């Protein structure tokens, strides 16, 4: 018992959207789990400070945007920011 969370299912889904026909071993799932669990904090912690400096109290997108501009090196930043911008401005249009 004592349920645990994970990201397995979502990983598998995303996998199916690129090589729709390729399996994934067990451990190589646990890895890709831990990896997300890492990057998540490595961004959220940074954004926390970044807000705390200018003495705000809320976290919004804008900083997450900046915070990304700091960690991801170069072209990955160029892409990810476009991705975010897009995949939010849609959502706000249709709640």
């Amino acid at each position: 018992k004592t349920r645990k969370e994970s990201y397995a299912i979502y990983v598998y889904k995303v996998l199916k959207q690129v090589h729709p026909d390729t399996g994934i071993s067990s451990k190589a799932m646990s890895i890709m789990n831990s990896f997300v669990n890492d990057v998540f904090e490595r961004i959220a912690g940074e954004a926390s400070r970044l807000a705390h400096y200018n003495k705000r109290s809320t976290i919004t997108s804008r900083e997450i945007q900046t915070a990304v501009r700091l960690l991801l090196p170069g072209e990955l930043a160029k892409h990810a920011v476009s991705e975010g911008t897009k995949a939010v401005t849609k959502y706000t249009s249709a709640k």
Binding site: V39, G45, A87, V88
Partner: protein, 108 residues
């Protein structure tokens, strides 16, 4: 009634509800905006997609059906823009990149 997933309303796959829960309970700030968990989840999804895709080709080029760590290693270490992001991580069951110095070879 007939509720809808916020992810749908975003058109993604990551559990935006789950994320937005995590931020509140992580002492990350005092109060969380609305748009943030969206933006965050989008970034995560994009990243993991990129890496998995690369690994897929990696393993196929070895003519196998599934994906195992050794692939992931051979996947990251070959793309620098990734490789920097993972300067200090260690993938178990990872081996190394095939490499030999130029001098230690025989004369010809």
């Amino acid at each position: 009634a007939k509720a809808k997933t916020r992810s749908s309303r975003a058109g993604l796959q990551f559990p935006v509800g789950r994320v937005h829960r995590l931020l509140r309970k992580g002492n990350y700030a005092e109060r969380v905006g609305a748009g943030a968990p969206v933006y965050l989840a989008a970034v995560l999804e994009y990243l993991t997609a990129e890496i998995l895709e690369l690994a897929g080709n990696a393993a196929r080029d070895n003519k196998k059906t599934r994906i195992i760590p050794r692939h992931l290693q051979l996947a990251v270490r070959n793309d620098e823009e990734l490789n920097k992001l993972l300067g200090r991580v260690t993938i178990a069951q990872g081996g190394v990149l095939p490499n030999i110095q130029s001098v230690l070879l025989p004369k010809c």
